[PDB]
């Protein structure tokens, strides 16, 4: 379903855009429904949850008797849902804002996060928006640049920081948006080097053998060294075996 919004560069420039979800992990539309062993009816079973205190007598506490609390080191800090709603981070939803422009080399592919890729087109039946978006896409492509943007699906969706980069094809041109990491999601692990390790250095014969292996198991072929490459095992066109 198309997602309409406005690409904003400051408080003066605004381009009407529509976003679609291009790539996402697909799950089964239907789910297994638990049914009674003998009657084979869904109405004959019922699921419910009960909370009981940790005392020996095993008292019973109703659902209205529980308040959510968090952990602060070695203690527990009560924090009611209503108080959390009062203190929650409030944002203005439906934002597609351009925080800045940055060189493509600085945005690496191993830092992409999220579970979706968005394709941003100009708004339907709008020549002016099409021209504006085409101008931005061509400028970014010529400069070899990407746009670091803030994205919020709606009022209650947590704001995200992501990258929009150009995608120009003969038929159509569009921006492609993929999420980027915050400071909290980065892991700082140190790994031992392999080039400088003395006991793991391969010999020349081993390198030649691995070269032969790589050459033999090539999954692409040149078209008689004439125009371009051809893929021998295209995985993007293979249906998902799970559903089959």
């Amino acid at each position: 379903i198309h997602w309409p919004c406005r690409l904003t560069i400051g408080s003066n420039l605004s381009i009407r855009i529509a976003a679609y979800k291009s790539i996402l992990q697909e799950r089964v539309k239907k789910t297994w429904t638990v049914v009674d062993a003998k009657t084979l009816k869904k109405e004959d079973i019922q699921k419910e949850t009960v909370y009981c205190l940790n005392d020996d007598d095993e008292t019973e506490v109703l659902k209205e008797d529980i308040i959510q609390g968090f952990r602060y080191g070695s203690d527990i800090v009560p924090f009611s849902k209503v108080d959390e709603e009062q203190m929650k981070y409030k944002s203005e939803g439906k934002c597609f804002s351009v925080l800045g422009f940055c060189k493509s080399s600085q945005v690496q592919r191993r830092f992409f996060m999220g579970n979706q890729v968005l394709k941003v087109f100009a708004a339907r039946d709008d020549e002016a928006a099409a021209v504006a978006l085409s101008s931005l896409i061509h400028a970014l492509d010529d400069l070899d640049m990407v746009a670091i943007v803030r994205y919020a699906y709606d009022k209650r969706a947590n704001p995200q920081v992501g990258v929009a980069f150009p995608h120009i094809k003969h038929n159509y041109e569009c921006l492609v948006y993929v999420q980027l990491p915050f400071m909290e999601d980065l892991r700082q692990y140190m790994f031992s080097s392999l080039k400088n390790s003395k006991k793991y250095a391969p010999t020349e014969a081993q390198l030649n053998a691995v070269d032969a292996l790589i050459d033999s198991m090539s999954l692409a072929k040149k078209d008689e060294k004439t125009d371009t490459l051809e893929d021998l095992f295209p995985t993007t066109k293979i249906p998902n075996p799970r559903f089959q």
Binding site: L99, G100, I148, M183, L186, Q188, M190
Partner: peptide, 24 residues
């Protein structure tokens, strides 16, 4: 090792989040 944090040893010290600062 240089850059090691003084609070949690064994982890790289994260530089403060500076946000967007436009170049000259």
């Amino acid at each position: 090792c240089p850059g090691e944090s003084l609070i949690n040893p064994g982890f790289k010290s994260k530089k403060p989040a500076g946000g967007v600062d436009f170049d000259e």
